[PDB]
């Protein structure tokens with residue numbers, strides 16, 4: 001219980017049907033440069049394989065990023081070898097995840113892309129390979145040196161066509177996604193119109209940071225009107241072209257994250273909330289960007305030093321433990337003095353109702369009167385840290401994540417209740433499960 005909480009109502013409507021969350025919704029995004037060491041994405045990397053399994057029995061590993069500008073496949077600047085691709089196959093087998101694989105359109109040749117694609121299709125195979133992507137954020141190639149100032153959608157469409165044609169010559173069944181950029185009208189909308197028969201889905205990026213002492217934990221917990229616009233833009237592309245969308249690179253802040261924001265418990269609330277907000281908008285899935293010890297990485301570490309779950313991971317863990325199923329109406333009322341509380345109701349594939357709550361209010365505890373659920377018993381797992389800016393001390397279900405993504409709940413809490421009352425501290429999260 002909490003001292004002076006904001007008393008809010010949550011009404012679940014099992015008749016207000018939303019989108020069905022696919023089982024491969026979860027995912028991660030990594031740099032292609034990781035493939036320069038064949039021990040990274042390897043059957044031997046049992047620690048990293050463990051972290052991914054805990055995030056989902058199904059999910060998508062996306063490899064790409066700015067380093068796909070300067071990674072170069074060779075059958076014998078970073079170099080990708082057949083051994084790296086062979087090892088990646090074994091990693092996907094250990095995790096059960098599917099692959100989005102970046103090809104080098106920024107600096108590589110169409111012929112080298114077709115050769116790399118052929119080797120990936122030879123070894124990873126059609127079942128595990130979801131899509132190739134032809135360049136990462138082509139709209140920023142100029143910013144990053146890789147094309148001249150005059151490079152525009154028309155030029156990129158020419159490149160894309162040349163690469164597509166060369167690859168399909170070597171790999172007739174090759175699947176593609178694109179354009180692998182932030183939402184925008186000059187690139188993503190015309191990409192969808194022009195290449196709708198040649199791609200499986202639209203690939204777009206999102207950073208809560210816009211174009212700075214102004215990305216703060218306070219700002220990160222607030223609604224992002226730009227995100228709502230971009231998501232609406234993607235749904236209109238889907239209506240116009242039939243192409244579903246996946247958020248294939250996202251994190252709290254770009255340029256590697258912001259110390260004191262991206263590496264904090266607040267990122268767990270942000271990331272868990274984002275996963276549900278995009279799933280409710282009809283996104284097919286998500287891929288949080290990371291690697292190394294970057295401020296925003298979900299999993300930190302290396303094969304030689306070992307891996308650990310960073311705060312953001314715990315947001316993704318809450319989503320993982322909720323599991324898949326159909327989103328339901330979950331209306332909040334009396335909530336104007338706790339406006340950053342979000343709630344998502346889910347009919348699980350196993351038939352049980354779940355509710356994911358993110359109390360993103362930094363200074364208000366809440367007391368949630370839950371109606372519209374008929375159950376003899378509800379339990380809560382809490383997503384907690386002692387302060388919103390904590391870089392550690394994060395737990396879920398009263399336990400940290402251990403080595404190799406090991407996680408089990410250690411604290412059982414019943415929700416008192418044809419209604420239920422749930423207290424939540426300021427800056428906390430909760431997963432409710434009803435028998």
Ligand SMILES: *[C@@H]1[C@H](O)[C@@H](O)[C@H](O[C@H]2O[C@H](CO)[C@@H](O)[C@H](O)[C@H]2NC(C)=O)[C@@H](C(=O)O)[C@H]1O
Nearest residue numbers: 031065066067136249254255256257290291294
């Ligand atoms: C998405 C890009 O694809 C991604 O590569 C960016 O991250 C990398 O590059 C930026 C800019 O140089 C670095 O600051 C990051 O540390 C890099 N991340 C990793 C994991 O190596 C990414 C971003 O800006 O953070 C997006 O632009």
